[PDB]
Amino acid sequence: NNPFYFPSRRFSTRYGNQNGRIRVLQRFDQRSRQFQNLQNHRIVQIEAKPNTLVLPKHADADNILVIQQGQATVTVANGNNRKSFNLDEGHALRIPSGFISYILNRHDNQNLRVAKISMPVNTPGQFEDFFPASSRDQSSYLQGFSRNTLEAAFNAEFNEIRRVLLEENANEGVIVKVSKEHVEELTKHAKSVSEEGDITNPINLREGEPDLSNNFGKLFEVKPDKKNPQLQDLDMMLTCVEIKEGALVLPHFNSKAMVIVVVNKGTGNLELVAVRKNREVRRYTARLKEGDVFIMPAAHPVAINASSELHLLGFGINAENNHRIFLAGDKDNVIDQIEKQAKDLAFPGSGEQVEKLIKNQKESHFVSAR
Amino acid sequence: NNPFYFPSRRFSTRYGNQNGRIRVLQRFDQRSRQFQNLQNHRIVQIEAKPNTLVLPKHADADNILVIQQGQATVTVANGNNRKSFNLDEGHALRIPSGFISYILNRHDNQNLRVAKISMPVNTPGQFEDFFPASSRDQSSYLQGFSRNTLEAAFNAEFNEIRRVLLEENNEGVIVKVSKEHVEELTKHAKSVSKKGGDITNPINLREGEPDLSNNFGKLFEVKPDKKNPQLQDLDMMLTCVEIKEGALVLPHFNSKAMVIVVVNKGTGNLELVAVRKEGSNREVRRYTARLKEGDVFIMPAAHPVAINASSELHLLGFGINAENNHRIFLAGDKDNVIDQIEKQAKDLAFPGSGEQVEKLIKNQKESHFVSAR
Amino acid sequence: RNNPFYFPSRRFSTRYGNQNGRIRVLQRFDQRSRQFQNLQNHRIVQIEAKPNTLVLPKHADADNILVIQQGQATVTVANGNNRKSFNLDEGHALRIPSGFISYILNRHDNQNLRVAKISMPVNTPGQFEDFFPASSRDQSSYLQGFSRNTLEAAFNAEFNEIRRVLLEENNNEGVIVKVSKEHVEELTKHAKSVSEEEGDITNPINLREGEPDLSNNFGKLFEVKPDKKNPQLQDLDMMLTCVEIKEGALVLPHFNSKAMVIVVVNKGTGNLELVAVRKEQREVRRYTARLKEGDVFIMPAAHPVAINASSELHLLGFGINAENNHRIFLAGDKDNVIDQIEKQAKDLAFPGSGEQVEKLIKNQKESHFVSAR
């Protein structure tokens, strides 16, 4: 009924067992053709129990992962290097396609929640995970090669190769339980957020001062610019918005960015306004819950009311030179920038009346829903 | 019958009243699949009566507008800034998606004609205009929000909000403006003559010296390069060609740019040559059209084109995939690629000898544009 | 069609062909399978020409990189104001921008010429046409597409002279013609061998220039990457790769991290193993093919691949999405990513202990290429 809204139910789990699960949202362009531009963006949500490890793999997709909740140790490896990072909530990490990575929940009793945006390299909207080891969920890709090839490659008997690499490990699946001793082994090397062979360092989305901030909300944003060259390559921005309970983000829009937003935490109500076929204004609404996804098309006015402390994670594509533009309040209010005489000709009220009404809201960006 | 030709009839009007109209060309890829690469480019033509104003709005499309005829005052506003520009014929202005703009015909008695290329951001080939105010043509998008949201947002009673912002002001989206209002809207208008929050200055397409020029024609071109960084972002070039009455642009093509051209003024005849399969044996196909003001046509890359002017012909060209494009000619002295073929190669390829081919080629002493006699 | 990544020479269809040679074009990749949609705008052309033979002047509405697979050529590139002729040997590559005229001389007395081309259409995804200025039994001159009046005004001559020297069929063989020894020497007299660039006529690239990236007794891999040294490869975001695998040797399981590669077999025979993870009809799928000269296959990014040479195997690779690509190995010493997994992670992932995994991995002391025995 609301094509911009993707409830957690629209996620299907790809890997899942007692230790956690890897869920993947449906392709956006399958929902509606108005998301064709988002066709090559898939949202992944990973949940892992304490002292749990997502086994090594690579995908034929480029990735940015962000910690929604908890604490992780994420490792990235290419042909000649490995780096392990301790990631906290609101930290992001780029994982280039074809690099191996694995994810440790390094917490004793808190669950790990991770959000990923995957951008397939080969087939628009489609990617696969490639595990070097076998498990009950999937075989090692090494099994795809012949006996002769494997033996020549590893310089060893097929029976040894099969015994140590190819068999199913002693079977949980791709997310396994890890002993305290093993956990400490895996975190000894990790470094915390605060380059080499395209293994780039983690980004702290909440680094420094928020772009927008008052008593009712904060918006943090990491833009595609000199400070983050890799975001330039992707033409993406990463945004973290926190809306206090009982507060509202004023009607606003991104001028050119299209944003996929996931609800990291909290509840609230989405209003999204659109013009469609002489021309009618359509209102779309949704009750936001943790794990939900929604799409903010560029230049479509949006307002969001927080039922409880609301944490939203935004992946913005087509982000270069984006402006986040407001329709009420003092700062960033584009309606205010219309010339007085133009306001007078456009609106029912006089220019004076329009300009007065506009000055009623003394605050900017976020205000109380009261 | 000619898929490259789009007569003014193929425009449908989206907004229209006594004061003018906003017309939009059909999606190019709906005509034919050979225009799939142009799918995200829509042509808009705006006509406005004197002392008339196209009301504030933004689109979910990136825009370049060009004055085809008359004089305008165009205002662009974002979240923290506003700039107003006096634009004359042949002046272009970039309006980023989501920025508000409005268009004043500041002339007392001459109509304003404006051409726009719109490139949708969300849905390939589709965009919508978003008006903050209501009118008989459309509701304010502010009406899409709830009473509670509006009241909290504006810090005011819904009744006041509805009274001053939400009600219908009626005329439509293009309204009549009093002389006094007109003078108010033009009072701080800039006349930028050269480049100077992503509110970029107007471009003069006829700035400086034309690329090509003789007694029969001129071609002006603004290329995607350091001088116009925004054209680099778009990988686009803007071209203005003026062909004298009774003159002909020589057979030629763009090496890699695809060009959407609109006929700003005049009449003429288009010849476009494509190679098409009837695998096996393929044939040369000739496409023609009688060009009239307001017509659009597509110049696919590397397809030879010639244009004969029935009367002073002004053509506006929006070139995509423009970087490192070469406009290459098939006759005449300068830019003639056939001339660059080695003499021995000419001899082997053509029916005549190398000497005969080279002599025939030297007959045309002129370049680019010649008399249709 | 059992292995969608493999394209045997039979899947090429000849577009132009006669006694002197033939121009063959591979089917569109996305018509085979939708997993090749990203390769939709890349067509593979294979040209074969007899000794002292010339492929007649033409341009395409496609961008092109050509590479000499075998023999020796003189290739000429012409735009509106310039011409350059290049002597190209095996493993030399040349960029031919769309809309530029080019022709290809087999300058050898008795060896055949084989040329591979990657064409990227400008107008219509996956589709392009060749535009010949001259007529032949295979195609008419595009100049015939223009009217008598236009031609006469353009060339400043009688239509009868124009038709006689330019438009008639040059008894006609086709687009590949025989050339006399004297004509051949005429065409090679100004050819350069592998100077400052000029009007986007860029110089030839030697794929085997300098030192190979990977090299040992069993194989070599040469690569030209999109970087400052080859600005035009940057524009294309492409890499060009030349791999030579000794008879009886194997390229270790490996993959490109992000590049998608179209590879053509220039010479030799071998066996392809390509591993894909896929959804059950999650399972590992093995694809194989017997490689022969003229075959094409697709290496999707991040899909493990191993290749066994039945005889000296020369592979030419066109890599798209190439920037920051890493060629990553799954066995051997250097570039082995499995080796980079932490010991404790190896232990948790694999059936063996970390120590056992790390020992087994050190068995193969060599890198990249090893003996198939």
UniProtKB/Swiss-Prot annotation, chain A:
Key word Signal present: yes
Region described as Disordered: spans on this chain: 187-210
Sites carrying sugar chains: N305
Swiss-Prot/TrEMBL keywords: Allergen, Glycoprotein, Signal
Domain Cupin type-1: 4-162, 203-355
Entry's induction text: Repressed by water stress.
Protein name: Allergen Ara h 1, clone P41B
Organism of provenance: Arachis hypogaea (Peanut)
Residues of the full protein shown: 172 to 586 of 626
UniProtKB/Swiss-Prot annotation, chain B:
GO molecular function, one term: IgE binding
Superkingdom of origin: Eukaryota
Induction section of the entry: Repressed by water stress.
This protein's UniProt keywords: Allergen, Glycoprotein, Signal
Carbohydrate attachment residues: N308
Domain Cupin type-1 intervals: 4-162, 203-358
Region described as Disordered: spans on this chain: 186-210
UniProt family annotation: Belongs to the 7S seed storage protein family.
Protein's UniProt name: Allergen Ara h 1, clone P41B
Whole-protein coverage range: 172 to 586 of 626
